[PDB]
């Protein structure tokens, strides 16, 4: 369970940076979309997989840009970042059901 | 599957596990599905000792991921000054560009990491 605790700590360490920097990512630009993939979506996938593995939870988080209907690419990034945090909440709820 | 384990430990920040994996033959060049090496992930996360371990065991300081970012790009975006300094000391390329011409200085400037931007400007 120590490995799972370390995963939570890594996730929260990553989250603190991602939550502030995501608001500056223009998702409609070439560099911004790429940076969102490289530095937000990819690490999130890895953390979520590491969280789910000790508990048999096999889910694949996918971004849903259709739920972010904004012309402003900064608002898209913030909205997609919120989907990341929401997925965390969903996995935590699944883990708590397994534990209880 | 030592490469995947190393990528995972380097992102999470499991220093002991990274050291164990390198001693047991893990590939320092292991690549995730986004083109990241472990050094990419540790530098982005600010894991200083893991960055040091990976560089000591042969990591390419200037590796590009599939989106055209180097470890220096990611540390300059994320705001980890000490990582940036260590990468520069190990020959990180300040003029590395992503697919739309963005340098590490550009990311540091756009994301408000002023100390890093100043270090990168002086290094250039």
Residue numbers in the entry:
A (entry chain B): 205 to 304
B (entry chain A): 15 to 138
Copy text from the publication:
The bacterial human pathogen Helicobacter pylori produces a type IV secretion system (cagT4SS) to inject the oncoprotein CagA into gastric cells. While the composition of the pilus is unclear, CagI is present at the surface of the bacterium and required for pilus formation. Using Alpha Fold 2 and Small Angle X-ray scattering, it was found that CagI forms elongated dimers mediated by rod-shape N-terminal domains (CagIN) prolonged by globular C-terminal domains (CagIC). Three Designed Ankyrin Repeat Proteins (DARPins) K2, K5 and K8 selected against CagI interacted with CagIC with subnanomolar affinities.
